[PDB]
Amino acid sequence: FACKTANGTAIPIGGGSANVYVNLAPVVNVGQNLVVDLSTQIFCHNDYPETITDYVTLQRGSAYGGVLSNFSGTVKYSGSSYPFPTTSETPRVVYNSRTDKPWPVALYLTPVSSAGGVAIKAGSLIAVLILRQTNNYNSDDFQFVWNIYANNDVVVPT
Numbered sequence: 369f370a371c372k373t374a375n376g377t378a379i380p381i382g383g384g385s386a387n388v389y390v391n392l393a394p395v396v397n398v399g400q401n402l403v404v405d406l407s408t409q410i411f412c413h414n415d416y417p418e419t420i421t422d423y424v425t426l427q428r429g430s431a432y433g434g435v436l437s438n439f440s441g442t443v444k445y446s447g448s449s450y451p452f453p454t455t456s457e458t459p460r461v462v463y464n465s466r467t468d469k470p471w472p473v474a475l476y477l478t479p480v481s482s483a484g485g486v487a488i489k490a491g492s493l494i495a496v497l498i499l500r501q502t503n504n505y506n507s508d509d510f511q512f513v514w515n516i517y518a519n520n521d522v523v524v525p526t
């Protein structure tokens with residue numbers, strides 16, 4: 369089991385960490401969602417589906433910088449929504465193919481009433497998402513840590 373980003377940054381068997389740089393809608397109004405869909409930038413696969421089933425969760429998601437201060441967050445994982453920053457590990461998604469499958473994580477971030485102006489700074493860390501991989505074969509319990517950075521400013525109109 370291993371993962372890679374859209375630009376080819378890899379985290380190999382056994383886990384590790386990587387940086388993911390995301391383009392963000394440049395203007396987001398109070399009452400609207402800023403959507404950060406990581407399923408277009410993070411992909412994983414099972415290296416031995418003949419014998420092993422891999423299990424993959426969002427173990428935790430943490431907010432940083434302007435996302436922590438200026439947004440009210442929800443994370444959608446494989447079709448279900450939960451609070452973000454997260455309050456529990458999600459259910460498991462099965463990985464059972466050698467063909468890359470997206471990691472089905474999306475953040476939905478809506479501005480808090482106090483938000484206004486440059487609510488997310490370009491280049492800043494906005495989230496850390498911990499992907500936890502286990503299986504039905506051995507005791508493997510690995511963390512794939514995704515540090516998510518904004519590529520651009522996000523302005524909340526006032």
Ligand SMILES: CO[C@H]1O[C@H](CO)[C@@H](O)[C@H](O)[C@@H]1O
Pocket residue numbers: 369370381382413414415416417420421422502503505508
């Ligand atoms: C040792 O086998 C590797 O590949 C299998 C199948 O993906 C994983 O379950 C396991 O944790 C390792 O990453």
